[PDB]
Scaffold this motif. Structure first.
Motif, PDB file in Angstrom:
ATOM      1  N   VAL A 301       0.893  -1.143   0.000  1.00 41.52           N
ATOM      2  CA  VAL A 301       0.000   0.000   0.000  1.00 41.52           C
ATOM      3  C   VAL A 301       0.952   1.218   0.000  1.00 41.52           C
ATOM      4  CG1 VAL A 301      -1.763   1.351   1.239  1.00 41.52           C
ATOM      5  CG2 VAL A 301      -1.836  -1.200   1.284  1.00 41.52           C
ATOM      6  N   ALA A 302       0.953   1.924  -1.114  1.00 35.10           N
ATOM      7  CA  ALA A 302       1.801   3.065  -1.326  1.00 35.10           C
ATOM      8  C   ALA A 302       0.982   4.361  -1.115  1.00 35.10           C
ATOM      9  CB  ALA A 302       2.361   3.025  -2.729  1.00 35.10           C
ATOM     10  N   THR A 303       1.543   5.317  -0.355  1.00 29.79           N
ATOM     11  CA  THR A 303       0.851   6.561  -0.054  1.00 29.79           C
ATOM     12  C   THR A 303       1.848   7.725   0.036  1.00 29.79           C
ATOM     13  OG1 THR A 303      -0.933   7.484   1.330  1.00 29.79           O
ATOM     14  CG2 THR A 303       0.800   6.370   2.509  1.00 29.79           C
ATOM     15  N   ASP A 304       1.324   8.905   0.320  1.00 29.16           N
ATOM     16  CA  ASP A 304       2.188  10.093   0.424  1.00 29.16           C
ATOM     17  C   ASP A 304       2.958  10.326  -0.861  1.00 29.16           C
ATOM     18  OD1 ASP A 304       4.306  11.350   3.151  1.00 29.16           O
ATOM     19  OD2 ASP A 304       3.524  12.335   1.409  1.00 29.16           O
ATOM     20  N   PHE A 305       2.223  10.417  -1.978  1.00 26.84           N
ATOM     21  CA  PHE A 305       2.827  10.733  -3.260  1.00 26.84           C
ATOM     22  C   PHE A 305       3.103  12.248  -3.364  1.00 26.84           C
ATOM     23  CE2 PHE A 305       0.622   6.751  -4.267  1.00 26.84           C
ATOM     24  CZ  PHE A 305       1.557   6.113  -4.993  1.00 26.84           C
ATOM     25  N   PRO A 306       4.140  12.648  -4.113  1.00 30.46           N
ATOM     26  CA  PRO A 306       4.398  14.047  -4.354  1.00 30.46           C
ATOM     27  C   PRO A 306       3.257  14.792  -5.052  1.00 30.46           C
ATOM     28  CG  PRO A 306       6.281  12.792  -4.959  1.00 30.46           C
ATOM     29  CD  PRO A 306       5.212  11.814  -4.643  1.00 30.46           C
ATOM     30  N   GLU A 307       2.526  14.107  -5.914  1.00 33.27           N
ATOM     31  CA  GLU A 307       1.414  14.678  -6.620  1.00 33.27           C
ATOM     32  C   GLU A 307       0.195  13.780  -6.497  1.00 33.27           C
ATOM     33  OE1 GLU A 307       2.142  16.976 -10.553  1.00 33.27           O
ATOM     34  OE2 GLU A 307       3.513  15.274 -10.475  1.00 33.27           O
ATOM     35  N   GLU A 308      -0.958  14.359  -6.174  1.00 37.02           N
ATOM     36  CA  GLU A 308      -2.121  13.486  -5.991  1.00 37.02           C
ATOM     37  C   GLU A 308      -2.947  13.358  -7.251  1.00 37.02           C
ATOM     38  OE1 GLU A 308      -4.152  13.219  -2.110  1.00 37.02           O
ATOM     39  OE2 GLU A 308      -2.396  13.645  -1.065  1.00 37.02           O
ATOM     40  N   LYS A 309      -2.336  12.681  -8.246  1.00 38.79           N
ATOM     41  CA  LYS A 309      -2.801  12.521  -9.604  1.00 38.79           C
ATOM     42  C   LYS A 309      -2.805  11.045  -9.959  1.00 38.79           C
ATOM     43  CE  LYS A 309       1.627  12.826 -11.870  1.00 38.79           C
ATOM     44  NZ  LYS A 309       2.578  13.529 -12.785  1.00 38.79           N
ATOM     45  N   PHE A 310      -3.582  10.689 -10.974  1.00 37.45           N
ATOM     46  CA  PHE A 310      -3.552   9.334 -11.496  1.00 37.45           C
ATOM     47  C   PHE A 310      -4.161   9.345 -12.888  1.00 37.45           C
ATOM     48  CE2 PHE A 310      -8.054   8.468 -10.717  1.00 37.45           C
ATOM     49  CZ  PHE A 310      -8.331   9.309  -9.672  1.00 37.45           C
ATOM     50  N   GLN A 311      -4.207   8.166 -13.518  1.00 39.34           N
ATOM     51  CA  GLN A 311      -4.792   7.993 -14.834  1.00 39.34           C
ATOM     52  C   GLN A 311      -5.867   6.941 -14.842  1.00 39.34           C
ATOM     53  OE1 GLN A 311      -1.743   7.351 -17.778  1.00 39.34           O
ATOM     54  NE2 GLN A 311      -3.208   6.685 -19.361  1.00 39.34           N
ATOM     55  N   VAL A 312      -6.936   7.209 -15.594  1.00 37.14           N
ATOM     56  CA  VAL A 312      -7.997   6.229 -15.823  1.00 37.14           C
ATOM     57  C   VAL A 312      -8.193   6.165 -17.322  1.00 37.14           C
ATOM     58  CG1 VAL A 312      -9.114   6.834 -13.658  1.00 37.14           C
ATOM     59  CG2 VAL A 312     -10.027   7.831 -15.661  1.00 37.14           C
ATOM     60  N   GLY A 313      -7.850   5.036 -17.930  1.00 39.16           N
ATOM     61  CA  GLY A 313      -7.866   4.980 -19.426  1.00 39.16           C
ATOM     62  C   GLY A 313      -6.960   6.057 -19.998  1.00 39.16           C
ATOM     63  N   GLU A 314      -7.495   6.952 -20.848  1.00 37.91           N
ATOM     64  CA  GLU A 314      -6.728   8.065 -21.443  1.00 37.91           C
ATOM     65  C   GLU A 314      -6.906   9.411 -20.723  1.00 37.91           C
ATOM     66  OE1 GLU A 314      -6.206   5.392 -23.394  1.00 37.91           O
ATOM     67  OE2 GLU A 314      -6.341   5.940 -25.550  1.00 37.91           O
ATOM     68  N   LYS A 315      -7.571   9.390 -19.568  1.00 38.28           N
ATOM     69  CA  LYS A 315      -7.793  10.606 -18.789  1.00 38.28           C
ATOM     70  C   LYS A 315      -6.766  10.690 -17.636  1.00 38.28           C
ATOM     71  CE  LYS A 315     -11.548  12.946 -16.308  1.00 38.28           C
ATOM     72  NZ  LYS A 315     -13.031  12.834 -16.175  1.00 38.28           N
ATOM     73  N   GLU A 316      -5.987  11.774 -17.594  1.00 39.46           N
ATOM     74  CA  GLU A 316      -5.193  12.174 -16.412  1.00 39.46           C
ATOM     75  C   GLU A 316      -6.091  12.935 -15.451  1.00 39.46           C
ATOM     76  OE1 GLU A 316      -0.874  13.934 -15.021  1.00 39.46           O
ATOM     77  OE2 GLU A 316      -1.892  15.151 -16.548  1.00 39.46           O
ATOM     78  N   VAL A 317      -6.255  12.408 -14.248  1.00 38.44           N
ATOM     79  CA  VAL A 317      -7.118  12.987 -13.244  1.00 38.44           C
ATOM     80  C   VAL A 317      -6.270  13.754 -12.205  1.00 38.44           C
ATOM     81  CG1 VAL A 317      -8.741  12.531 -11.358  1.00 38.44           C
ATOM     82  CG2 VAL A 317      -8.681  11.071 -13.481  1.00 38.44           C
ATOM     83  N   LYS A 318      -6.597  15.021 -12.019  1.00 34.77           N
ATOM     84  CA  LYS A 318      -6.095  15.838 -10.942  1.00 34.77           C
ATOM     85  C   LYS A 318      -7.331  16.483 -10.289  1.00 34.77           C
ATOM     86  CE  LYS A 318      -1.603  16.815 -12.979  1.00 34.77           C
ATOM     87  NZ  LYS A 318      -0.695  17.884 -13.552  1.00 34.77           N
ATOM     88  N   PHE A 319      -7.219  16.795  -9.012  1.00 35.56           N
ATOM     89  CA  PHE A 319      -8.274  17.458  -8.277  1.00 35.56           C
ATOM     90  C   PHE A 319      -7.958  18.928  -8.138  1.00 35.56           C
ATOM     91  CE2 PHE A 319     -10.209  13.520  -7.711  1.00 35.56           C
ATOM     92  CZ  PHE A 319      -9.391  12.652  -7.067  1.00 35.56           C
ATOM     93  N   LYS A 320      -8.887  19.715  -7.643  1.00 37.52           N
ATOM     94  CA  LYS A 320      -8.706  21.191  -7.668  1.00 37.52           C
ATOM     95  C   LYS A 320      -7.630  21.633  -6.708  1.00 37.52           C
ATOM     96  CE  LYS A 320     -13.468  21.527  -9.187  1.00 37.52           C
ATOM     97  NZ  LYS A 320     -14.838  21.904  -8.690  1.00 37.52           N
ATOM     98  N   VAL A 321      -7.730  21.204  -5.460  1.00 36.85           N
ATOM     99  CA  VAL A 321      -6.849  21.624  -4.391  1.00 36.85           C
ATOM    100  C   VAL A 321      -6.559  20.473  -3.470  1.00 36.85           C
ATOM    101  CG1 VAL A 321      -6.551  23.219  -2.418  1.00 36.85           C
ATOM    102  CG2 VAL A 321      -7.822  23.977  -4.444  1.00 36.85           C
ATOM    103  N   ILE A 322      -5.296  20.261  -3.163  1.00 37.93           N
ATOM    104  CA  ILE A 322      -4.843  19.277  -2.192  1.00 37.93           C
ATOM    105  C   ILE A 322      -4.558  19.994  -0.897  1.00 37.93           C
ATOM    106  CG2 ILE A 322      -3.120  17.480  -1.550  1.00 37.93           C
ATOM    107  CD1 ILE A 322      -5.140  16.942  -4.087  1.00 37.93           C
ATOM    108  N   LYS A 323      -5.257  19.614   0.154  1.00 36.21           N
ATOM    109  CA  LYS A 323      -5.025  20.157   1.465  1.00 36.21           C
ATOM    110  C   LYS A 323      -3.640  19.757   2.028  1.00 36.21           C
ATOM    111  CE  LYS A 323      -7.458  19.778   5.864  1.00 36.21           C
ATOM    112  NZ  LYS A 323      -8.452  20.597   6.627  1.00 36.21           N
TER     113      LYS A 323
END
Ligand SMILES: Nc1nc2c(nc(N3CCOCC3)n2[C@@H]2O[C@H](COP(=O)(O)OP(=O)(O)OP(=O)(O)O)[C@@H](O)[C@H]2O)c(=O)[nH]1
Ligand SMILES: [Mg+2]
Length: 323
Positions: A301-323
């Motif tokens: 179980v990997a956590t505490d990534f430098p960027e809270e991003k990922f990919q689903v199919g061909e979509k790169e997902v980022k959120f608006k604001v990381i607390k």
């Protein structure tokens, strides 16, 4: 240590039902739903309705806002189940109304009570269509605000890594199996007598405010088992777009058959440290895998990534604001 697993909505509840069937020990299990018929079908020991007023026991109709309202209406029921708890896993299949809408309210309520709050969320198969995925991703953005760590598993990655299935039922059984291994691998190293136990305090320091979390698992058998298992786990994440090798905190479970001595962990952990980030803080435990022989499974179980991003199919997902 008081650990609870709460399934929210149909899919989430089904995963917790599988955990029960798989023999999870030392944890209290709950299923929460707005759909009373579905609850009645489960073997999970504790079954709780939310949303009687807004749904009449008939589910949330795929509307996250109705799932959210159901949880808020019954926030007292939720607080009661969360009393006297150290850690909670909130299992939800994202994309419907109840899991998507209610899971963030349950997570926020737990976290405000100081409970280590770990979401275990699936993103839908491609065969479920584009609207279910949009709703899932929107809900995930609310769930993340409300959680310490949120383990995100994309069902298409489970399908890629598993035997072909001929019914949708069997496709979901593979998902439930993986979710059950994932959760039982964390709980069993804390609350059962294990091969190498981990202190709850170390699980908290690993996962508290960890954010996005990604799991990878690998099996190894025979003479090269440590290298095989580690390589498979690190290269088989269940969510694309953020390699396990960049995480700053990791929780590793080594499942071992009864004939494998504990010092297999020396080689496993050397191999993991060689593959992942040099400054990563890694906690690990080891537990028996019944009915196996000459076998390990490494689950990361990997956590505490430098960027809270990922990919689903061909979509790169980022959120608006990381607390
Ligand atoms: N782990 C697991 N997940 C399942 C399972 N079944 C599903 N679905 C649920 C949707 O219909 C097809 C199969 N899901 C997933 O749950 C997601 C949400 O559906 P749901 O949990 O049935 O919805 P709900 O939270 O009960 O919302 P509602 O009140 O019915 O709108 C779906 O997109 C599926 O990926 C399952 O047995 N196990
Ligand atoms: Mg439902």
């Amino acid at each position: 240590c008081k650990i609870k697993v709460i399934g929210v909505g149909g899919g989430g509840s089904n995963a917790v039902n599988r955990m029960y069937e798989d023999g999870i020990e030392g944890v209290e299990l709950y299923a929460i739903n707005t759909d009373v018929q579905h609850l009645s079908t489960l073997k999970v020991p504790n079954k709780i309705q939310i949303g009687e007023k807004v749904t009449r026991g008939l589910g949330a109709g795929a509307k996250p806002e109705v799932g959210e309202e159901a949880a808020l209406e019954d926030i007292d029921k939720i607080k009661e189940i969360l009393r006297d708890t150290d850690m909670v896993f909130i299992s939800a299949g994202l994309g419907g109304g109840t899991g998507t809408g209610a899971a963030p309210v349950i997570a926020k309520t737990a976290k405000e009570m100081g409970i280590l709050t770990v979401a275990v969320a699936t993103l839908p198969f491609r065969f479920e269509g584009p609207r279910k995925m949009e709703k899932a991703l929107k809900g995930l953005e609310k769930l993340k605000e409300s959680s310490d760590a949120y383990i995100v598993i994309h069902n298409d990655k489970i399908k890629e890594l598993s035997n072909r299935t001929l019914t949708i039922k069997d496709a979901f059984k593979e998902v439930d199996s993986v979710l059950s291994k994932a959760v039982r691998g964390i709980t069993s190293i804390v609350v059962t007598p294990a091969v190498i136990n981990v202190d709850f305090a170390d699980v908290r320091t690993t996962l508290e405010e960890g954010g996005l979390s990604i799991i990878g698992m690998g099996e190894g058998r025979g003479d090269e088992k440590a290298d095989i298992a580690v390589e498979k786990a690190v290269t088989s994440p269940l969510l694309e777009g953020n390699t396990i090798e960049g995480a700053r905190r990791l929780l590793v479970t080594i499942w071992t058959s009864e004939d494998i001595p504990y010092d297999i962990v020396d080689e496993v952990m050397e191999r993991i440290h060689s593959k992942v980030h040099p400054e990563a803080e890694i906690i690990f435990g080891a537990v028996l895998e019944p009915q196996e022989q000459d076998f390990i499974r490494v689950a990361i179980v990997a956590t505490d990534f430098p960027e809270e991003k990922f990919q689903v199919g061909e979509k790169e997902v980022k959120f608006k604001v990381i607390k």
